[PDB]
């Protein structure tokens, strides 16, 4: 069902951008392992950081996992998730730390978690 004629152009483009930059991060992992992250071009450091922030924002707390951790479960609507990933990809949240995105609901919870570190 991940076709523009089924899910709309905005959803399709967001999903494909996420895939594209996670794949670009996969391609950089092997050189980061050898030489360290300081050899990367200035724009490659940015795709690395945004890829790690996407990887964190993909996490979510569950109502059934509410007994393995203590976090309350979150329900995220499709509109909010594409609204958040489209925001991350184009750099409007570049200033937050990675941990602001770990185990949150919509992006407006990540901006709040950033305040409490």
């Amino acid at each position: 069902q991940l076709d523009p004629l089924v899910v709309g152009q905005e959803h399709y483009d967001t999903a494909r951008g996420v895939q594209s930059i996670l794949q670009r991060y996969q391609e950089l992992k092997d050189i980061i392992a050898i030489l360290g992250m300081d050899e990367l071009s200035e724009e490659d450091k940015l795709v690395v950081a945004r890829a790690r922030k996407i990887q964190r924002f993909l996490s979510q707390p569950f109502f059934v996992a509410e007994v393995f951790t203590g976090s309350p479960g979150k329900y995220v609507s499709l509109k909010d998730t594409i609204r958040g990933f489209k925001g991350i990809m184009e750099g409007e949240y570049d200033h937050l730390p990675e941990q602001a995105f770990y185990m949150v609901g919509s992006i407006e919870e990540a901006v709040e978690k950033a305040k409490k570190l």
């Binding site: 392992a33 050898i34 360290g36 300081d38 050899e39 200035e42």
Partner: protein, 284 residues
């Protein structure tokens, strides 16, 4: 996976580790040669700063623009950077410190200008959009003063012409063979001498031809040595940082060898058994 496909990558990573070891050795020798050339440069600046202190802060203290703190409305920086990568985080720490201070200066609404030594900063600041106005690149292992004459001349002319004020040099201070720190230091207006030449009371030079036109040349030549000194210290810091970075890269390669060999062993065991089981089970 595939046993042959994994053995090929084990060989590739071993070759990489060997290359990085050779680079560590080369850098560890160039570091010694560079840090001796660094010591060959002290006497000029020292024995010239004593003279400048005598003519400037001694008796009959003369008056010169480079000695006094006119009000600041725009600032200038001389930026030294490496021409070669693989130096670790050396250049980016320095450029980030420069951007922090240059942003603090533009909070007060002052304008700022840049002069670049080395190709890396030239590449960086055009991407950030900095106002570079003069540059020299391609120095490599052989930094001449007769090439630093140019941009230092540009900054000195822009200073005495009234445009710039309070110009700086930013560079990496070589402190230990594994410790180098980015520093921003003030060259003009001339920093204040710790020592006092009141003891020089008892003598005065027979200035031929005349003291003011001579102090001008002394001050111009002095900023040049201090810049040149900054360039050579930055070069020795680059060599030390590349040494450390290639050391780390050789150890990372040496661990990837362990992981890839574990994977290769599992792959070759599985291949032996998957073949021999097919043979034995095929024989009715």
């Amino acid at each position: 996976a595939g046993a042959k496909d994994i053995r090929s990558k084990i060989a590739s990573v071993q070759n990489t580790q060997k290359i990085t070891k050779a680079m560590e050795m080369v850098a560890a020798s160039k570091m010694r040669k560079s840090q001796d050339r660094m010591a060959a440069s002290r006497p000029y600046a020292e024995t010239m700063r004593k003279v400048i202190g005598h003519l400037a802060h001694g008796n009959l203290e003369y008056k010169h623009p480079y000695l006094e703190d006119r009000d600041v409305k725009r600032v200038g920086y001389l930026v030294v950077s490496t021409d070669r990568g693989l130096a670790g985080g050396l250049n980016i720490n320095l450029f980030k410190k420069l951007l922090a201070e240059m942003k603090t200066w533009t909070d007060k609404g002052v304008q700022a200008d840049l002069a670049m030594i080395g190709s890396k900063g030239v590449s960086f600041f055009n991407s950030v959009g900095g106002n570079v106005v003069a540059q020299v690149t391609g120095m490599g292992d052989n930094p001449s003063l007769s090439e630093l004459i140019g941009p230092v001349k540009v900054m000195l002319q822009a200073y005495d012409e009234g445009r710039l004020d309070k110009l700086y040099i930013v560079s990496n201070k070589f402190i230990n063979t594994m410790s180098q720190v980015p520093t921003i230091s003030q060259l003009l207006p001339l920093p204040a001498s710790d020592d006092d030449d009141l003891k020089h009371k008892s003598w005065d030079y027979l200035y031929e031809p005349d003291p003011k036109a001579l102090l001008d040349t002394l001050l111009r030549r002095y900023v040049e040595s201090q810049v040149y000194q900054g360039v050579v210290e930055n070069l020795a810091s680059e060599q030390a940082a590349r040494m450390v970075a290639m050391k780390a890269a050789t150890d990372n390669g040496g661990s990837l060898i362990k992981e890839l060999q574990l994977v290769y062993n599992k792959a070759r065991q599985a291949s032996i058994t998957q073949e021999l089981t097919e043979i034995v089970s095929g024989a009715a």
